Each structure stands twice: as C-alpha cells, then as structure tokens.
Design a protein around this ligand. Structure first.
Ligand SMILES: [Ca+2]
Ligand SMILES: [Ca+2]
Ligand SMILES: [Ca+2]
Lengths: 141, 66
C-alpha cells in the first residue's frame, strides 16, 4: 500500500471557524517514528488560530509540535521520544489545523492549504519513507 | 553542516531522531564525520538534551539558525 500525506478539502463559511485535517495513509508495519514538514495556507483568506495533534499521534504532549513561523507558514514536527514502541501505526488524521475564515473572503472562492518543500518521514528503523503528497483547501461556501 | 548529524545534506526529523537516540545512550556515533560540529548547537562541545531542545526549535521555525 502506497504512503500518502494529504490535506483535506473542507467546506466552510466566511466569518466562521474551520478545521482542516492533515492525514497519513499507507503507514507500513514499520510505522512512523519521525516527521517534519511545512504547511502553507492562503493567509489572505484564513487566520491561523492553532494546530492540534490528530488521533493517530502517540503521546502528543511530548512528541508533537506545530508552530506558526510566519503568516501563511506552519512547521510541523513529530518524534517518538521513546525511540522504541511509540511509533504511529494507524492511518488517519495526523494534525487538525484550526483557522478562522476571514469575513471578507468571497463565497465560492478557495483558500489553498498545501505542503511546502520537502517533507520527511522516518519509520521505526529511521529509514526515510517517501510520501505521495496531495494538497487541500478550504472551499468557501 | 551544524544539525545535519546523518550527513545527508538537510536538517530534518531523522537528524532529530538520531540526536534522541544519542541522548538516550542508544547511539554512540553519528554518521557525520564530526559528531561535535554536527551535534553541538549551543557551543559547549558536548551533545545533550539542550542541543536536542535547540534542534526542535529550529525544526519548528522558532529560530532560523544556531
Ligand atoms: Ca540530515
Ligand atoms: Ca561520527
Ligand atoms: Ca551542546
């Protein structure tokens, strides 16, 4: 099964909040022990509020972080700090990105949310796992 | 070079993992030619939890360099 890093395409309303899930699929029996990647978003339409570990993440209070580096640019990091049996084993949501949709944003327009540059994932052997990337968006309705 | 403990050309979460294994006492030697140049990010010529903390800040974009 192929390994995929994807960002959902979600609907939301100008003036409202929205969650944009970032997902992994095709995690092997070797799991995921490390991750780093950048997420860009259309800051002319979206205001970043926070980012939370998704349900597949082990011990997120220790292992996971997300930081807004600048407007439109997030950095995401995961490590199994145990380096032993804390790898991610289950496909699903890896991060939930929480935005407020700007009230000025036009109905029917799209706010792109994308992976930027090179993402890195390491399995439980610390071997790189190359992800197929699919980008997403907030579809304003 | 500084931060690139596996020598692959980029500083990433696999370097962070290798640093964790070194701290945990599970890895004795980095693939880098010079473990200190690669692994010491605060300038005491040793590798410890503080260098790891610094790499985390870098990978999170909280700093732009060491
Ligand atoms: Ca490296
Ligand atoms: Ca070495
Ligand atoms: Ca040091």
């Amino acid at each position: 099964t192929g390994f995929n890093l994807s960002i959902d395409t979600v609907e939301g309303n100008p003036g409202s909040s929205v969650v944009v899930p970032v997902k992994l699929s095709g995690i092997s029996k070797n799991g995921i022990s490390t991750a780093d990647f950048t997420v860009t978003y259309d800051a002319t339409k979206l205001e970043y509020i926070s980012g939370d570990a998704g349900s597949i993440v082990t011990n997120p209070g220790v292992n996971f972080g997300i930081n807004k580096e600048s407007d439109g640019k997030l950095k995401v990091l995961f490590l199994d700090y145990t380096m032993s049996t804390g790898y991610i084993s289950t496909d699903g949501v890896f991060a939930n990105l929480n935005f407020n949709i700007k009230s000025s944003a036009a109905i029917g327009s799209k706010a792109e949310v994308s992976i930027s540059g090179t993402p890195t994932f390491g399995d439980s052997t610390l071997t790189p796992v190359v992800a197929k990337v699919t980008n997403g968006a907030v579809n304003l309705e | 070079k500084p931060g690139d403990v596996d020598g692959n050309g980029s500083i990433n979460s696999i370097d962070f993992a290798l640093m964790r294994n070194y701290l945990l006492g599970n890895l004795k030697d980095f693939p880098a030619e010079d473990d200190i140049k690669a692994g010491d990010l605060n300038g005491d010529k040793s590798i410890n939890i503080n260098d790891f903390a610094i790499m985390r800040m870098y990978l999170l974009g909280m700093i732009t360099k060491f």
